[PDB]
Ligand binder design. Structure first.
Ligand SMILES: *[C@@H]1O[C@H](CO)[C@@H](O[C@@H]2O[C@H](CO)[C@@H](O)[C@H](O)[C@H]2NC(C)=O)[C@H](O)[C@H]1NC(C)=O
Ligand SMILES: [Zn+2]
Ligand SMILES: [Zn+2]
Lengths: 647, 647
């Protein structure tokens, strides 16, 4: 039998008993006072312990106001807990709906043949913080501070971009509590709870789980698709999307959140970009006096061009093609749940959420293209000087350009992919500079050593991503670090005859230098896994170029004044770049909400942060290091290859 | 005001008028006759034309039986059409629910202030075809033939694997009509229409859109996760997921479907696998008399091993690492919507849906490992014979092994990825055999030519996938085909001096041979895009090895009887392999339902189809072709390199 109850507007908690096989229909008449009133109706099952063995849905509640509707099926079962009380939000009535009256209908049923007591909570949350995103003339930023969020009273906004003349929009949520919450956004026509065919395929709803920070970027193309959005903030009752351990799953914890809503206008960062190019083009004047003037004073390739390793480009270009496919097929809402930027220092350009991280890689392209051009132009000598490193200096400029393609692609969506490919091209540039100085006095160094160098770099960075969740990953690196460095110490003595002068102290310097690094990242959690292999290559590259320079003065060979300047600029730029690299703090083993909570502001001009200066000083470091090795043996330009000392 | 109506069980169509701001509550009392009765309640808006300008949801209908519930929000808007009549299925009551009576409650509302006429259709579809998947003792396959499917009466099954002792399960749907339909499957506890947090991330519902065939594989690990499933078949009212063109979006078309339910037991295919290994190990006896006996009769590497191109392995191993990540992160339900197998010839092993397509690539691994071992073992001569191709014959065996890794990885999930990587390693094996015969009389062929060969293969197959949707993609291939072949014809005359004897007819044979192929795939839609570049490499490889053999008799050099046998086995095996390759019929430009409709049965032993014999005869073809080039110049073993003719 069906029982109809008339419920007043004053009644906020409704306690009734659902007799066996009885249906309760509760009605609340709605008038103009309910326009833009976001209402939450929740149901409680009194004496939840009585229904422990009863499986399935014990109580069914359906709430409707004629415009929106939802279903409350209790218990609502989560992976960790079962809740015998839950509610949902009813999209408010609008002035179009309103003499004539709307009405709020709640229907309660149960398949159980026993009597069931329940409680209905009708919560209102409106009149502010809903209808807040209305921007007055000449205003671009609005702020809500310390808005309280409970499991009973969620937060919810409505954004009409057609009404507010909004082209791009940014939402930021600040919280100091580490309490799990959810940021749900959908188009106004869509429903949070209503599933659509091909859910994962066609999905316009974004659910960002956060603790201390969360960011929403409504791109200009997304605003035009829907023209209006609904933003909701809920407390996650299960902390799985934000924490790995199960801790006090059942709780009643309030959460204070601060909001910032930006009305973004498309802009060109002409001042930070021009000042970045002036800073990057200034050190290229070192090429002018020594390298370029020789090209002025002077005025089979197909055998070298078809045997040159061009499959070293494929690891980077096949990653770029896959990351662009994964980016253009993703929906506008999926790009916010998937890509993890540092939104305190993320400046957008179109759909790109961090343009500063993409354009700051232009020093690698600029310098890499100069390394290729100058090496090709300055190869015009067979009896005097050291052997010309023309094709290895072109390979260093290729990986300098590839590092700009690999990093600009990582910064489009920084998600936890199998092959990271932000740093790895730096590790090849550093190993190629050691291969150059290894053979420069023996022979003309071959770019064929890039294959074993790149395969070892690509295989090692995939081996760290695969075992990153494990506890012994830093030991897997250390045993490879010893095997790789113990092989180089054995390759040196076999080549140089194990002389006590040069070979005996090369081994101790590299054994103590690399063991001091292993003790730092193995016995101490000094660096992150993404930074461990990159710091080890830079230190070994610097240690070898310092050994090569220390051996040069020990053999009574003078280092030119220019090579000492470029050598000190190489040490200085690698230390400044390594200081900004040390501040990345990106671990893909932690939860998505902990990866979102990390926010470090911009250091310079509102555009450059610690990461963008690592891109800028990593290319300066690669520039000055390339200019040092190219100038260090200029005093030997008139010495016969037979007289030249070999180390 | 709320109006309560009592509706009898005889009333199948309910026509009422929803007055302005009135709520109708309709009740149907349910008794034991409704156990396992899957019911569909649909609502119609009479005079749909009256509500054309009214936006949003005009009518709201909520149906519940105490155990299940749903919401009908009319009009249900699809991308192409708006439907003013739709319904959903109510999960049936069970004997646990049943003196005591259940009841079916329908609630009707409208936000409109005008009167609205509606019709309620209560359709029953049960007592057979629901509770049909009960398997009697000793029965493993059940079949339903020509089950009629309409938009008003959908199909729906219930599978209890705990009750039926089912470990693995396969569902197949056969239809001869090209009418769009949907195959929806979910766990019994889950709901088709109830959305879950992180929908795309945590999704156990599979929606397969099909026209003529659809397949479901319940793996052993999925059966254990849920233990019971609900299978539904609906007619897609919008044909977007199955057709590209909008055609008669509104229709009332019946569809006849045939079902086949298999109770699969885990099995080892010992007979097809052993007979495949006997067939693959038999032709290895050609290595025994000539190659191996020399190794018996006879009884700097680090310079070649560190300069050997090992970055040619990275394109294939970095694709395998990405396809395994995309496979282990996918849910059990997503692997059926994403991977497109030929399920008429797909034999499963564990989670792998096509084990026959993975294990038939073992001839590439077997032969590739023999190519590596024999080449390394038979390099022990500098004045007699042709130049030893030791490191290029190892590179051919590396890409022979890589083709087994690249194809076994493609067959785990054949989805439309950016880089296909099923054939491309064959194109390098065919180009490496031309590089071998190009230089074998000039010098020792270098594996360094693999870089430009692999980069061109990888770049070309990505260029076809990128432009596959376009209409001019076969012209993009043809201009690259002419540029590549016109470069080889120019490289031949520059090397051989443009002699009328050998160079003048090499150009005409390769210009007419490659233009005859272009006319076939450009002016005719002969091959698929996946097969175009692979057929062009095989024909040029065969044309060159035939030119090399025709030049050999023109220079009065005898071809040994064994090399003529292996040469005829190379032509025969490339024609048999090319006959099974021609039958792939995989186009990623067509709809997913058209990619699912393709089903070609197994040819041999219930295990081998056209594709699996392409894997088997593609390795025989690569075996016999490798044995031909290794034996063709054995008559020159006692001829000085100065006397040896060069062509
Ligand atoms: C968001 O705001 C816009 C603009 O204020 C709304 O657009 C108007 O919609 C009414 C119907 O309700 C039309 O009669 C007007 O022509 C529209 N005005 C303009 C300037 O286009 C839009 O409907 C609103 N959408 C939501 C979800 O509230
Ligand atoms: Zn970076
Ligand atoms: Zn294949």
């Amino acid at each position: 039998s069906v029982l109809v109850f008339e419920i007043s507007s004053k009644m906020k908690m409704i306690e009734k008993k659902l007799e066996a096989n009885t249906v309760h229909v509760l009605r609340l008449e709605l008038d103009q006072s309910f326009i833009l009133d976001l209402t939450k109706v929740a149901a409680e099952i009194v004496d939840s312990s009585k229904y422990s063995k009863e499986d399935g849905v014990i109580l069914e509640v359906t709430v409707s106001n004629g415009r929106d509707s939802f279903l409350l099926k209790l218990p609502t079962v989560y992976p960790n807990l079962k809740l015998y009380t839950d509610g949902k939000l009813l999209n408010p009535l609008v002035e179009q709906d309103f003499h004539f009256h709307q009405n709020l209908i709640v229907t309660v049923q149960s398949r159980l043949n026993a009597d069931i007591d329940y409680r209905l909570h009708v919560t209102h949350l409106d009149r502010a913080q809903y209808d807040f995103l209305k921007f007055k003339t000449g205003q671009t930023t609005k702020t809500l501070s310390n808005q309280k969020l409970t499991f009973v009273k969620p937060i919810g906004f409505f954004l009409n971009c057609s009404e507010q003349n909004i082209s791009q929009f940014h939402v930021t949520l600040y919280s100091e509590d580490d309490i799990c919450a959810n940021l749900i956004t959908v188009p106004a026509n869509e429903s949070i709870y209503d599933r659509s065919v091909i859910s994962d395929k066609t999905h316009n709803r974004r659910v960002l789980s956060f603790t201390k920070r969360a960011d929403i970027f409504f791109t200009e193309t997304e605003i035009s698709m829907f023209k209006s959005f609904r933003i909701f903030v809920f407390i996650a009752p299960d902390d799985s999307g934000c924490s790995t351990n199960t801790s006090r799953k059942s709780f009643n914890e309030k959460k204070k959140i601060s909001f910032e809503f930006k009305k973004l206008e498309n802009q060109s960062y002409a001042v930070p970009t021009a000042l970045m190019m002036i800073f990057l083009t200034t050190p290229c004047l070192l090429f002018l006096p020594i390298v370029i003037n020789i090209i002025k004073n002077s005025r089979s390739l197909h055998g070298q061009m078809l045997q040159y390793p061009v499959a070293i480009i494929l690891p980077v270009l096949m990653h770029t093609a896959i990351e662009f496919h994964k980016w253009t097929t993703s929906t506008m809402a999926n790009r916010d749940e998937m890509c993890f930027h540092n939104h305190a220092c993320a400046r957008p350009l179109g759909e790109l959420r961090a343009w500063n991280n993409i354009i700051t890689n232009i020093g690698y392209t600029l310098y890499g293209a100069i390394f290729i051009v100058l090496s090709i132009c300055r190869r015009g000598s067979h009896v005097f000087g050291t052997y010309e490193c023309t094709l290895l200096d072109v390979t260093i400029g290729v990986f300098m350009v590839l590092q700009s393609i690999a990093s600009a692609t990582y910064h489009i969506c920084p998600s936890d992919v199998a092959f990271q490919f932000d740093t790895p091209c730096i590790q090849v540039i550093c190993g190629l500079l050691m291969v150059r100085q290894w053979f420069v006095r023996h022979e003309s160094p071959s770019p064929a050593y890039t294959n074993i160098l790149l395969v070892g770099v690509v295989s090692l960075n995939f081996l760290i991503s695969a075992f990153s969740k494990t506890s012994y990953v830093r030991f897997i690196i250390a045993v490879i670090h010893v095997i790789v460095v113990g092989s180089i110490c054995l390759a040196k003595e076999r080549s140089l005859g194990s002389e006590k002068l040069k070979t005996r102290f090369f081994i101790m310097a590299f054994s103590m230098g690399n063991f001091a690094a292993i003790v730092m990242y193995l016995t101490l959690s000094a660096f992150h896994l993404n930074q461990i292999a990159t710091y080890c290559f830079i230190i070994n590259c610097i240690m070898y170029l310092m050994y090569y320079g220390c051996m040069k003065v020990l053999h009574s060979e003078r280092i030119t004044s220019k090579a000492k300047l470029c050598g000190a600029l190489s040490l200085l730029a690698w230390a400044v770049a390594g200081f900004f690299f040390f501040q990345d703090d990106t671990d893909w083993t932690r939860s998505a909400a902990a990866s979102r909570a990390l926010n470090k502001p911009c250091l310079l001009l509102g555009f450059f942060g610690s990461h963008d200066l690592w891109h800028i000083f990593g290319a300066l470091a690669g520039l000055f290091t390339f200019i040092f090795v190219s100038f260090v043996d200029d005093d030997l330009i008139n010495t016969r290859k037979t007289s030249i000392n070999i180390f």
